[PDB]
C-alpha cells in the first residue's frame, strides 16, 4: 500500500485513481465503501 502518492488502486474490484491519505471518518462495522453527497466515493476501508 502506497500513501500520499498518486497511484492506481483496486479495492475488492473497485478501481480508480487518486491519492490515499489517512482519514478520521468512523464507518460502521457492516459498511465497506463511502460516498459523498452526490456520487463520488470519498472514502474507502482497507479490507486487511
Amino acid at each position: 500500500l502506497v500513501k500520499n502518492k498518486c497511484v492506481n488502486f483496486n479495492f475488492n474490484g473497485l478501481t480508480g485513481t487518486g491519492v490515499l491519505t489517512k482519514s478520521n471518518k468512523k464507518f460502521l462495522p457492516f459498511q465497506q465503501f463511502g460516498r459523498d453527497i452526490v456520487d463520488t466515493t470519498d472514502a474507502v476501508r482497507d479490507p486487511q
Binding site: 471518518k25 464507518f27 460502521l28 457492516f30 459498511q31 465497506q32 465503501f33 463511502g34 460516498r35 453527497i37 472514502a43
Partner: peptide
Amino acid sequence: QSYTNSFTRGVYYPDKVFRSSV
C-alpha cells in the same frame, strides 16, 4: 388478537454507504 398503532418503529439501514451529518 387486537389492533394497535406503531409510533415510529420499522426503520432499517437501506444500504452500506457511510455518511456523516447529512
